[PDB]
Each structure stands twice: as C-alpha cells, then as structure tokens.
Amino acid sequence: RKGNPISVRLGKNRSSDSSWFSEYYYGKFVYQDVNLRSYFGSIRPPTGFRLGRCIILHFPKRTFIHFFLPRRPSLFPFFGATFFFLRDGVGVYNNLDAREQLLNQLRVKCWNLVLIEKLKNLGGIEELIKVIDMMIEIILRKRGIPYRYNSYFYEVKKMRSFLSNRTNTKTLIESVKIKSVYQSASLIAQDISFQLKNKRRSFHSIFAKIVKEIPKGVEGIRICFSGRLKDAAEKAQTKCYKHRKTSCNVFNHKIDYAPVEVFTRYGILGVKVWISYSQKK
RNA sequence: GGGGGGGGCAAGUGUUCUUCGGAAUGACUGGGCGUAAAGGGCACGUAGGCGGUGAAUCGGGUUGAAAGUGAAAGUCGCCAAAA
RNA sequence: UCUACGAAGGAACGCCAAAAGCGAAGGCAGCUCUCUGGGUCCCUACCGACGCUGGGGUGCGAAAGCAUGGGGAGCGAACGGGAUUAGAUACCCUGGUAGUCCAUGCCGUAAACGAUGAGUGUUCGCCCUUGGUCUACGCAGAUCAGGGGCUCAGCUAACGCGUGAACACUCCGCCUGGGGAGUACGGUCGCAAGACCAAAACUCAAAGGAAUUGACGGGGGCCUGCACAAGCGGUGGAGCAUGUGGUUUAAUUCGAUACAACGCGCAAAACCUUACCAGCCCUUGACAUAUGAACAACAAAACCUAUCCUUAACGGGAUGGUACUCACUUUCAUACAGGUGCUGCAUGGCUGUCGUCAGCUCGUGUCGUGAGAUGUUUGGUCAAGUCCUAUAACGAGCGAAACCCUCGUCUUGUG
RNA sequence: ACUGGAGGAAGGUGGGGAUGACGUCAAGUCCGCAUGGCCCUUAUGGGCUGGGCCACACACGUGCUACAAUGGCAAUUACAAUGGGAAGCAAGGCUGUAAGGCGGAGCGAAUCCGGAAAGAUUGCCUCAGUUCGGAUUGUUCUCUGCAACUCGGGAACAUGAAGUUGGAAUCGCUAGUAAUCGCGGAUCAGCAUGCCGCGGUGAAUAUGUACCCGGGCCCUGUACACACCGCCCGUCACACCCUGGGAAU
C-alpha cells in the first residue's frame, strides 16, 4: 500500500543515476555506488552550504562524476589527443596564471635571499654550476612553509586523488552550478533539515519561506513532518501542507521524494518532501 | 521538594475566621414559572387589591408658602490651621 | 365444533362520526319522555357602574381503593396448571375469584397535560369550519359567537406560537443548584388505605434544557460483495512435518495474539546461527578516539608468512624466519569502547489494517448568536461523489478512471 | 446511459498485474536500522567449548500422505515452461543391487546442462485392510563437514500403526479458475511436507439480493462521545459517617 514515486517511474520518467553493467563485478559495483552516495553527504555542511544530486557513470577504467551545486548563500597511439581532449576543460584554478605571476616575481622573491650569504657564497661558488644549482634549488622547495597559491576548490584534485588511488581507475569529477537553488527534492530536504537543527525554527515560517521563494513553475509541493512535535514532548504526531497539483497515482509526473531525520535530543523529528515538476514546459 | 532567578506588595506582609460587593445568586431600583425549578385539578366566594364617563360641592389625602424641631459628634462642600 | 330456532340473562352502545359538538374542570353519547343548569344571535326595551381577581374558607373532582346491599355476561389483579428458560414469580396458552356494573355513602387523588392561572384592551392576512343574524338575484356579500390549520410581523438560549409564547396592564400561586425528599418529626381530615401542610443535619461541583456532529439500534427506505444462493474441494477423525498455548530441567531464547498472530522474524538451529543454559576465561576489553606517565629504535622490540609442544577448545609456550616504523598500535594506566539490558505508553523509518473500499475535504459565497448547514441532500446512470440532470452555491484539491507494464491480433525494422 | 447488431483476432474496464485517500486501531517492532530516557561498566559487556532452541500427561493451526479399482504396480510411448550453472551445471565410457564412485566432450552459457509428470499401449491385480496404506520399525552403508550418541540428508533390503470419505461445524473458489499433474528457483557445504515462480490437464455453477452475513446511503430515535464489548438499575456481603423511631430517663 502507498508506494513512493521512485519504483514506478524508472520505466519512463527517470534514468537511474549510474549507467553501466557487470556480470562478475555487479556485487562490487552496487556497493561502490551506495557507499559513495553515503559520501558526498556530510562534507562541511554546517550552515544551505553544500548539497547534491551526483549523477555518476562508470566506463572500463574511466569514471565520470557530475555533481549539482547551488549558489553559495601524428601517431594515433598518442591517445592523449582524445583523453586530455576531454579530461581538462574545468578551469577550476587554471593555475597557469597565478603560477605565471609567481614565476614573474619568483626571481625577485628568491634572488633577494640569494648579501651575507649571497656575495660570499657567489665568491666561494664561482671559485670552486649544476652542484651550485643544488644549493640553488634548496630554496625553491623551502616554500612549503610560505605558499601563496589558491583554488576555488581544488578539493576536486583531492578526491580525484583519494578515490582513484583506492579504486585504481582513471576518474573525472566535475561540479555544475545548479542555478535555481533546490528545485530538487533531496536539496529541499537537506535544507530544511538544517533550519530544524539549531536553533529551533517555525514550521509555518519554513513553509512561508517555501511559498515565498520556490514557486517558480514547480507544479506543486506536498510536505509532511513527523516526530515529537512542539512541544508537549509526548504523543508524537504529524502535520502536512499541500498545494495546487499534488498527485502520485498519476504516472508521467516527475515527483521526487526523499525524507530526512534530524533530532532535538527529545527523540528525533523527520520530514518528507514530495515536490512535483511541471512537465512539458 | 531543593538551588538559582524573577513579579507583587512593604514595616509590614500570608493563611483562617468574620460581613458586604462581584451576586440581576430573592431582582423595588434589578428576574422568572411551554419544553430547563417553578401556573394550583378546577371553580365559588371572604376579607384585600384594583377597576366607566360627564356635572357639582368639600378640602382628608394631595400640593404652595412660614416658624419650631429634626442633640451634638458623623457623612458631605468649602475654608482655613496639621503633618 | 358446527348447523337452524328458542330461552335465559348481563354488558356496551355498531354506522352516524366529526382536528364535529356541550361543560368551570373530571367529563358527556342506542333511542323517547318529564324536570333542569349555562350559552349565543337578535331591533334591541329597561337598568344603571352594580365589574376583575381572590389569602385563610366552600363545593365539584375519572380510575383504582373502602362500606352495605344487589348483579356478575364478557373481561379480568390474586392465584392453578400448560408452558417457555441457565433460571422465570414474567411476557405466551388454558382456567379463574376480588374488581368492572347498580343502589347509596367514604375517600379526594392522575402525564387532573393546550406539560401554557384568571381577566381587559390594542394586533397583517389567507384558509377553513359549528351555530345565529342582515343583504341576496345566480351567488354570494356582510356580520357575531366559537373550534381548527397557515402565515406578515413580534418574541424565543433552542424548538416554535402567533384564540400569543406579541404589545401592555391588575390580581392570584409558586420558583431560588442537585442530592437527602415530597423523606422524618409534627398538626389536622379519613373506617382503613392514606391525604394535606413539610423541612434539616449531611454530601457534591455540578444536576440540566434545546440543538449540532458522529456513532449506534433485534425500526424504516433503497443498493451491493464465493457473504449467502448454484456449486466444487478441503482443515476438524488416523499418521506424520511445521507453529503456537502450555510444564521441564541447564536451556527448552525472544518478538508476534479476532478478522488484521500461531509453515509467523526463519530466504534455511551440528558447532556457527544465538540473545537463552553450564563450564572456560578476558575486563582502556574484539572494537574507537586522546591520553601522555612510558619505552627507545634511527632500527630494537614488537608484529607476521611457517616448525615444534601443551589447552575439551580460546589460547598459550616457545622457534625460526620474515618484516619496521621517529613512530611506535607498543605497553599498561586513563576518559572510554560496549550491552540482542529495559523501554514501540518517548520516537523516526517501515508495515498490517479497514480497502482497490468510493468515499474524504478545502477556498469564496451565502445560512446559523453558535456548535455547524450548503458545495457531495433532487430524477436517473456507474464498478465510482463516474457522469448527466436538477441546483444558493461557483470552483479546486484528494480519491476513482485513464496514464504504467503484461498478454492477446496485426504493422514495420535487424536478422 | 442501457440493450442488442456490425466489423473485428480482441466490444464495450478484452485478461492480468502494478498502482492503495482522509484517516482509524497509544496495532507491530527500541531484537533489523536509527533514536529519547533509564540502568551494568572486572559487569546484563567480549570471545571458547559443551549443552539448549528438537521434549513431553496434554489442545489448538497450517501442510502432507491416503482409505482405492475414475484405481495400486511392471514393462512399453507423448507433449512443456520457466529457469539454474565457476565453493558451478556436466553428455559419453567405466564401477557399484543401487545411494554412491571413477573421470570427463562442452559450457560463465539463445549455442554446453536438464529421462517431465499426468496422460496414452498391454499385462498383473478383481476389491481385500489388500500389490491400496504407509508412520513406527533392523542390519549394512554412504554425502558434507574438522567434526552426524542429545544435534544433518541419502540408498539397499524386512517389519507394516491407524486409515474403508473423517461429528458439529468451518474454510476455499464464477474459467484456464477449482481440483490434481509435475517442472523450476530461493536461502545454503550438508536441507523443504515451507515459500516464490513455471508449465501439463482440466470442469461444477451463475438463482442474484429472499435469507443469515458484510459494507454504504439517509430517514428517524438515543440518557452513548473510551461513542452499545456503551452507558446503567436494584438486592446482598464490606468500611466510615450522619440521622429517625424507640421502653424507661
């Protein structure tokens, strides 16, 4: 009785997130999918600050990953000619330019050290060049302590290290700014599960913010709560709000649903969100 | 119930007793009695209450005026001293 | 029994007939006659304000009851049996006296109920209708007394009345929470039964009226489901397998409990699974962070591929070898880790459930002082609040349908 | 809208699934997971073996087997579908009465693997407690595992409980369904009378709302609102309290 809207719509509406196939490894691909969905959540979400849908793809030694982030509040066996053709186009910290600036002012910021140990050393050195390039390169790798490079989030490099090391495959991680924030359902759930965490907030104010900002062509929003409500602390009960088009017995209706559970030390409260998308726009 | 904190009053506070008000909750001012408590089983009739007109008279009630009295203290208005 | 005629009696009065009529009220009817109360109509004559109500008082006052004397058909308390039931003083049957009836007396009470004191004046109408009166010219129009509906307004907490429960009036009786209680005491009246005046102690925060929703009903009023009906086969009897109810120790682990638990978690108990029971031990623990007193290694130690030995097993004891980290997991010590420990009457999630039932509702509008009513209350259709029709609602959401897949027929395309 | 009729392979939701409102029942489970609160912190914690979860005077539930001759058995022959297979499915040959054993063509699987059972042909039976019926019930054995006395299947052969349609009741079903026929997975070394799926064969009956039953409507009545398994009256037994009559005073 009363299924959710996932198990019906995979036939027509939705494409399941991943896309691949195995015969012997399926048993170790369903897990490399589920645990990684567990990951991408609980990654500096304090507040919201960070969310996601994370459509993934697996190829034979290639793995595509595409997050979805809202706004912050010759010889042919040179196959490099088609690999970096596609594993490059980010622009996330195209360190070419800031590295260029560091290259420019590097001469000064090092040559001014290299004259109590500059001229004396030049005397002893041009008396006694590659081995001098050794007492030269000692200071290039001194700047582990002071360092002025940057990145919006090179955490992409960070994870393309972690997982490619522990899985042994060529990987690609991108993030795309989902502009119209939380038109999805997992996003809305992740959101209101933050305001319900400290400090406390109003249900009616949450729904007022919702009807304030979100109704931009979304067909309807049906939202339920549950838990030890405010505030008799006994007899946990339910309440739910509705809107124009709130249907699930009708097919061909992308209506995404993902509950969540956050607490108040008085037991736990849990919300559910059943949005409905205007189809055929 | 205990710790802390705060409100109300203040050389006074709180409980009980005591009487009025709220209490139109005995209703003259200020009610009800069909279904809510309350119209008698019904009438008769005694006092008793109350109850047509116009004309006349009297002046008991009625009413207008004066004095006596309605102790002083009290209530109250003012005034002044008193703190 | 019946069937025709008779006789005896008693008792009530069929139809008319009547929300009709008469009475002050209780009441009153087969008929005829004597006597007799009150009434209304009527030119109107007189008469003259003599009226209205009415404390204590006075009569009347159904039924049952009492007294004395009649009568006793039928009915029928009490009682008898047939019954009926777990039981039956009952309801059901058959008997059946007192009683019903008449004569006179006694009580003096009834839901004596329009549950509405009595009287006077003023009030929009319509419909009637009992009996009077005036006027009649196709026929009624008018006017009085009443009896009965329906209404304008007015009032009412609500229903409702409107011959008032309206607008006002005078008089009478009474009420002041429920219970205790119309009880005790007491005074009168009665042959008795009893009647009439009639409290309080004590006790509670309620007792209650009308109306709304909802449920309910061995009540109507439809309509429907292997529910029943037409069926066909099964558990219940025997033997086994499984599960639970039980009782048995050391355990017979635990949760499930009408449809909606019990071949259920279980999609799989040798040990393991396993919480349960005994031995066997461990306790910063198998596991996690920080924790530095530590120990020192710039490679020790540990630690681990393999050999040996003991432990019912865990281990453990070696014993090589491999193997290294300036971090040692390596050490004890800590803060702790942990608990299939308790709690679903704290919860989330999940599920069963009514039920694939067709019913749930919302927004404005109205109506209701209000709770709430309307939309979904009409005639039909549907498997459906599916639909049309009607409509003070107009609409929307949820639900249903169709969307989905599948099979079935066929079309094409890769083969 | 209904009734037919047409075509059509399908006629009026063609059949099946899927999909399951408000909400109700403090329904279920803190023993899956998560979680509040409360307790133990050499213990209710961790691990090891043993032993227990499998018993039994006992009732109840679900499933299986049949009492037969529409049949039990032996030899002949006919027809599936799903599916499953690398801790794997394994043809053939050889070996064992057989269960088992030796080894292996192919197959990670439209290609390799898999005697369908009913049914049908003949014969035996000839109506028995039986050649129907098989629990209990002996010896040999064997599969796994390190390990089969309490505590997994499997084969040989002998024994052969009750059972002759099973009370009252009560349950399941309206056409590929009932009933039976097997076949195939599932968890898993060892395993199904259980569960999930697949196909063989295959009807009874449609009187329809009279009835009991169940549900809805709406129309009435209610003292019910924990909503009839509701409220609720009265005697008696019980405690405390108050009060009346009452001889005599």
With a CB cutoff of 8 Å and minimum separation 6, the contacts of A39 are none
Q: Tell me the one-letter amino acid at A108.
A: V
- As ranges, strand D nucleotides with an atom below 7 A of a protein CB are 18-23, 26, 34-37, 108-109
Q: Tokens 């196939």 identify what position?
A: A21
Taking the C-alpha atoms of residue A197 and residue A48, their distance in angstroms, rounded to an integer, is 12
| Residue A101, CA atoms < 13 Å, CB-side half-sphere | 7
What radius of gyration, in Å, describes the C-alpha atoms of chain A? Answer: 27
- Between CA A266 and CA A227 the distance in angstroms is 9
Judged by C1' against the alpha carbon of A23, the nearest nucleotide is D108
Closest nucleotide to the alpha carbon of A225, via C1': C348
CA of A28 to C1' of D50 (A): 40
**CA A209 / C1′ D56 distance in Å:** 69
How many CB atoms neighbour CB A173 within 10 A? 21
- Header resolution in angstroms: 3.9
The answer to whether A191 and A182 have CB atoms below 8 angstroms apart is yes
Q: A116 exposed, middle or buried (CB, 10 Å; 0-12, 13-18, 19+)?
A: exposed
Euclidean distance between CA atoms A271 and A222, whole angstroms: 11
CA of A249 to C1' of D5 (A): 38
Measured CA A104 to C1' D206 distance, in angstroms: 98
Q: Which amino acid is at A46?
A: P
A232 token code pair: 């008799």
**Dihedral angle sign, alpha carbons of residues A215, A218, A222, A228:** negative
Q: Using a 7 Å CB cut-off, which residues contact strand C? A: A 1-4, 8, 11-12, 226-228, 233-236, 238, 242, 244-252, 259, 261, 266-270, 272
Provide the CA A153 to C1' D236 distance, Å, integer: 90
Residue with tokens 């969310």: A51
Instruction: Pick out residues whose CB falls under 7 Å from strand D.
Output: A 1-3, 8, 23, 234-235, 240, 248-249, 261, 263, 265-268
Among A169, A191, A171, A173, which Cα is nearest to A181's? Answer: A191
Render chain A in DSSP notation, one character per residue. ----SHHHHTTTTPPPS-----SSSHHHHHHHHHHHHHTTSSSS----------EEEE-SSEEEEE--B------TT-THHHHTTTS-TT-TT-THHHHHHHHHHHHHHHHTT---SSHHHHHHHHH--TTTTHHHHHHHTTTTSS-----S-THHHHHHHHHHHHH-SEEEEE--B--STT-SSHHHHHHHHHHTSSS---HHHHHHHHHHH--SS--EEEEEEEES-TTTSSS-EEEEE--S---SSSSS----B--EEEEEESEEEEEEEEEE-----
Please check whether residue A66 is in contact with residue A54, taking contact to mean a CB–CB distance below 8 angstroms. yes
- Phi first, then psi, for residue A243 (nearest 5°) are -160, -165
Distance, CA of A148 to CA of A51 (rounded, Å): 29
**Protein footprint on strand C: which nucleotides are under 7 Å from a CB?**
346-356, 396-405
* A226 DSSP β-pair partners: A238
Residues in a beta bridge with A263: A268
Q: Residues near A257 by Cβ (< 8 Å), separated by ≥ 6?
A: A4, A5, A6, A185, A272, A273, A274, A275
CA distance A43 to A278: 31
Quote the CA–CA distance of A257 and A147 in Å, as a whole number. 46
Distance CA A35, CA A128 (A): 61
Spanning CA of A57 to C1' of C414, the rounded length in angstroms is 29
- Six-digit token string for A132: 């001098």
In the numeric block, the tokens 């360092």 are attached to: A147
Q: Which residues neighbour A48 within 8 Å (Cβ) at sequence distance 6 or greater?
A: A73, A190, A191, A194
Distance CA A265 to C1' C335 in A: 23
Please indicate the experimental technique that yielded this structure: cryo-EM
| Gap between the Cα atoms of A90 and A155, Å rounded | 13
